[PDB]
Write a protein that holds these residues in place. Structure first.
Motif, PDB file in Angstrom:
ATOM      1  N   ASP A  25     -89.054  18.021 -67.392  1.00 33.45           N
ATOM      2  CA  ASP A  25     -88.988  17.685 -68.804  1.00 33.45           C
ATOM      3  C   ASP A  25     -89.086  16.187 -69.074  1.00 33.45           C
ATOM      4  OD1 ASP A  25     -88.341  17.398 -71.485  1.00 33.45           O
ATOM      5  OD2 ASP A  25     -86.743  18.883 -71.434  1.00 33.45           O
ATOM      6  N   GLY A  27     -89.341  14.699 -71.691  1.00 33.73           N
ATOM      7  CA  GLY A  27     -88.661  14.361 -72.934  1.00 33.73           C
ATOM      8  C   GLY A  27     -87.159  14.262 -72.766  1.00 33.73           C
ATOM      9  N   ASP A  30     -82.047  12.638 -69.033  1.00 32.02           N
ATOM     10  CA  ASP A  30     -81.285  12.996 -67.858  1.00 32.02           C
ATOM     11  C   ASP A  30     -81.370  14.473 -67.501  1.00 32.02           C
ATOM     12  OD1 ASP A  30     -79.814  10.518 -67.165  1.00 32.02           O
ATOM     13  OD2 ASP A  30     -79.024  10.783 -69.223  1.00 32.02           O
ATOM     14  N   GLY A  48     -77.446  16.337 -77.227  1.00 35.38           N
ATOM     15  CA  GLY A  48     -77.821  17.306 -78.256  1.00 35.38           C
ATOM     16  C   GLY A  48     -79.217  17.038 -78.778  1.00 35.38           C
ATOM     17  N   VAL A  82     -81.481  26.144 -70.475  1.00 38.74           N
ATOM     18  CA  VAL A  82     -82.381  26.162 -69.317  1.00 38.74           C
ATOM     19  C   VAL A  82     -82.157  24.943 -68.429  1.00 38.74           C
ATOM     20  CG1 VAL A  82     -84.172  25.123 -70.739  1.00 38.74           C
ATOM     21  CG2 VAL A  82     -84.799  26.176 -68.569  1.00 38.74           C
ATOM     22  N   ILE A  84     -82.938  21.779 -66.616  1.00 39.38           N
ATOM     23  CA  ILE A  84     -83.911  20.733 -66.896  1.00 39.38           C
ATOM     24  C   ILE A  84     -83.818  19.566 -65.932  1.00 39.38           C
ATOM     25  CG2 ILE A  84     -84.353  18.877 -68.557  1.00 39.38           C
ATOM     26  CD1 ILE A  84     -83.456  20.864 -70.742  1.00 39.38           C
TER      27      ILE A  84
ATOM     28  N   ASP B  25     -93.487  15.501 -74.452  1.00 39.20           N
ATOM     29  CA  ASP B  25     -92.392  16.324 -73.934  1.00 39.20           C
ATOM     30  C   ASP B  25     -92.870  17.599 -73.250  1.00 39.20           C
ATOM     31  OD1 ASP B  25     -90.050  17.658 -73.405  1.00 39.20           O
ATOM     32  OD2 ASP B  25     -89.238  17.422 -75.428  1.00 39.20           O
ATOM     33  N   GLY B  27     -91.217  19.584 -71.599  1.00 40.38           N
ATOM     34  CA  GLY B  27     -90.183  20.598 -71.720  1.00 40.38           C
ATOM     35  C   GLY B  27     -90.285  21.384 -73.016  1.00 40.38           C
ATOM     36  N   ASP B  30     -94.004  23.883 -77.894  1.00 33.70           N
ATOM     37  CA  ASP B  30     -94.744  23.579 -79.098  1.00 33.70           C
ATOM     38  C   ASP B  30     -94.391  22.188 -79.624  1.00 33.70           C
ATOM     39  OD1 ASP B  30     -93.486  26.731 -79.645  1.00 33.70           O
ATOM     40  OD2 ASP B  30     -95.643  26.405 -79.330  1.00 33.70           O
ATOM     41  N   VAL B  32     -93.263  19.644 -82.484  1.00 32.76           N
ATOM     42  CA  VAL B  32     -92.397  19.622 -83.652  1.00 32.76           C
ATOM     43  C   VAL B  32     -92.249  18.218 -84.239  1.00 32.76           C
ATOM     44  CG1 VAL B  32     -90.292  20.518 -84.622  1.00 32.76           C
ATOM     45  CG2 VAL B  32     -91.020  21.276 -82.332  1.00 32.76           C
ATOM     46  N   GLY B  49     -83.521  25.422 -79.132  1.00 30.20           N
ATOM     47  CA  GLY B  49     -83.214  24.060 -78.729  1.00 30.20           C
ATOM     48  C   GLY B  49     -81.990  23.988 -77.842  1.00 30.20           C
ATOM     49  N   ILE B  50     -81.617  22.780 -77.431  1.00 23.41           N
ATOM     50  CA  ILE B  50     -80.491  22.593 -76.525  1.00 23.41           C
ATOM     51  C   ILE B  50     -79.172  23.070 -77.108  1.00 23.41           C
ATOM     52  CG2 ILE B  50     -79.897  20.292 -77.363  1.00 23.41           C
ATOM     53  CD1 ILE B  50     -79.978  20.946 -73.631  1.00 23.41           C
TER      54      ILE B  50
HETATM   55  C1  LIG Z   1     -85.492  15.622 -79.044  1.00 27.69           C
HETATM   56  C2  LIG Z   1     -85.470  15.588 -77.494  1.00 27.69           C
HETATM   57  C3  LIG Z   1     -85.676  14.125 -77.002  1.00 27.69           C
HETATM   58  C4  LIG Z   1     -84.118  16.142 -76.950  1.00 27.69           C
HETATM   59  N1  LIG Z   1     -84.156  16.842 -75.669  1.00 27.69           N
HETATM   60  C5  LIG Z   1     -85.173  16.675 -74.639  1.00 27.69           C
HETATM   61  C6  LIG Z   1     -86.499  17.421 -74.875  1.00 27.69           C
HETATM   62  N2  LIG Z   1     -86.565  18.769 -74.244  1.00 27.69           N
HETATM   63  C7  LIG Z   1     -87.560  19.632 -74.938  1.00 27.69           C
HETATM   64  C8  LIG Z   1     -87.205  21.123 -74.998  1.00 27.69           C
HETATM   65  N3  LIG Z   1     -86.183  21.661 -75.875  1.00 27.69           N
HETATM   66  C9  LIG Z   1     -85.277  22.735 -75.387  1.00 27.69           C
HETATM   67  C10 LIG Z   1     -84.362  22.483 -74.146  1.00 27.69           C
HETATM   68  C11 LIG Z   1     -83.110  23.401 -74.213  1.00 27.69           C
HETATM   69  C12 LIG Z   1     -85.150  22.771 -72.833  1.00 27.69           C
HETATM   70  S1  LIG Z   1     -86.071  21.073 -77.412  1.00 27.69           S
HETATM   71  O1  LIG Z   1     -84.878  21.708 -77.954  1.00 27.69           O
HETATM   72  O2  LIG Z   1     -86.180  19.645 -77.536  1.00 27.69           O
HETATM   73  C13 LIG Z   1     -87.506  21.818 -78.155  1.00 27.69           C
HETATM   74  C14 LIG Z   1     -87.595  23.195 -78.389  1.00 27.69           C
HETATM   75  C15 LIG Z   1     -88.737  23.722 -78.997  1.00 27.69           C
HETATM   76  C16 LIG Z   1     -89.811  22.884 -79.315  1.00 27.69           C
HETATM   77  N4  LIG Z   1     -90.996  23.411 -79.876  1.00 27.69           N
HETATM   78  C17 LIG Z   1     -89.707  21.507 -79.103  1.00 27.69           C
HETATM   79  C18 LIG Z   1     -88.553  20.970 -78.528  1.00 27.69           C
HETATM   80  S2  LIG Z   1     -82.905  17.898 -75.355  1.00 27.69           S
HETATM   81  O3  LIG Z   1     -83.467  19.072 -74.785  1.00 27.69           O
HETATM   82  O4  LIG Z   1     -82.067  17.897 -76.527  1.00 27.69           O
HETATM   83  C19 LIG Z   1     -82.017  17.054 -74.054  1.00 27.69           C
HETATM   84  C20 LIG Z   1     -81.187  15.989 -74.400  1.00 27.69           C
HETATM   85  C21 LIG Z   1     -80.477  15.328 -73.390  1.00 27.69           C
HETATM   86  C22 LIG Z   1     -80.650  15.718 -72.059  1.00 27.69           C
HETATM   87  N5  LIG Z   1     -79.959  15.030 -71.036  1.00 27.69           N
HETATM   88  C23 LIG Z   1     -81.473  16.797 -71.722  1.00 27.69           C
HETATM   89  C24 LIG Z   1     -82.140  17.494 -72.734  1.00 27.69           C
END
Ligand SMILES: CC(C)CN(CCNCCN(CC(C)C)S(=O)(=O)c1ccc(N)cc1)S(=O)(=O)c1ccc(N)cc1
Ligand SMILES: [Cl-]
Ligand SMILES: [Cl-]
Lengths: 99, 99
Positions: A25, A27, A30, A48, A82, A84, B25, B27, B30, B32, B49-50
């Motif tokens: 990931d 994006g 960490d 978050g 999931v 990451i 990203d 990860g 799609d 957004v 999302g997370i």
């Molecule tokens: C705004 C992003 C920079 C924030 N994150 C990272 C990007 N992951 C991208 C995948 N995502 C789901 C995740 C459960 C795998 S998401 O919720 O951002 C997402 C979902 C759907 C779509 N279409 C786009 C984005 S984070 O996941 O919040 C995060 C924050 C801190 C850490 N240490 C680790 C993960």
């Protein structure tokens, strides 16, 4: 290797003697894994974004293997939907984005 | 280009004639974007999302440029921490992960 993005880029990792599947990931700042045991000290953290925040435990200087690549870094542990792998560990294996 | 991950892979995109910064990203399934105006009709979509699932607006066949690379694809709009470019457009512009 060269990993396509037609599908989620899922790889096998080994940590705590455990094999796990995880998302590479770009994006994520960490690495954050679902609940597990890890050795040593930890401190709480909130991470978050979409859909809100979750509480994690931050462990530092954890050894991990990604695709046979050895690396050390921070691993967050908590209720992520999931597993990451974040940039903090992607850099150590020399992972880059290319187009 | 070749983009390393010691810092966030934030790039400039162009959509609706306006420049915006967005996160590449791998990860994200799609793309957004932060709340904005787009043409045509939209449909509802739930994304995981997370911190939980949320509702966003799906616009299809939208012109968008990513680091100067032209694309036309699906763009979702909603309360995201940052503009995110996900695999649907990363694939389109020929992006891979490499190590
Ligand atoms: C705004 C992003 C920079 C924030 N994150 C990272 C990007 N992951 C991208 C995948 N995502 C789901 C995740 C459960 C795998 S998401 O919720 O951002 C997402 C979902 C759907 C779509 N279409 C786009 C984005 S984070 O996941 O919040 C995060 C924050 C801190 C850490 N240490 C680790 C993960
Ligand atoms: Cl709706
Ligand atoms: Cl698309």
């Amino acid at each position: 290797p060269q990993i396509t993005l037609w599908q989620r880029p899922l790889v096998t990792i080994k940590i705590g003697g455990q094999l796990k599947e995880a998302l590479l990931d770009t994006g994520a700042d960490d690495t954050v894994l679902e609940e597990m045991s890890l050795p040593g000290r930890w401190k709480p953290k909130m991470i978050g974004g979409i859909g809100g925040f979750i509480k994690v435990r931050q462990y530092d200087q954890i050894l991990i293997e990604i695709c046979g690549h050895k690396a050390i870094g921070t691993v967050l542990v908590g209720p992520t939907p999931v597993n990451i792998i974040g940039r903090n560990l992607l850099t150590q294996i020399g992972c880059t984005l290319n187009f």
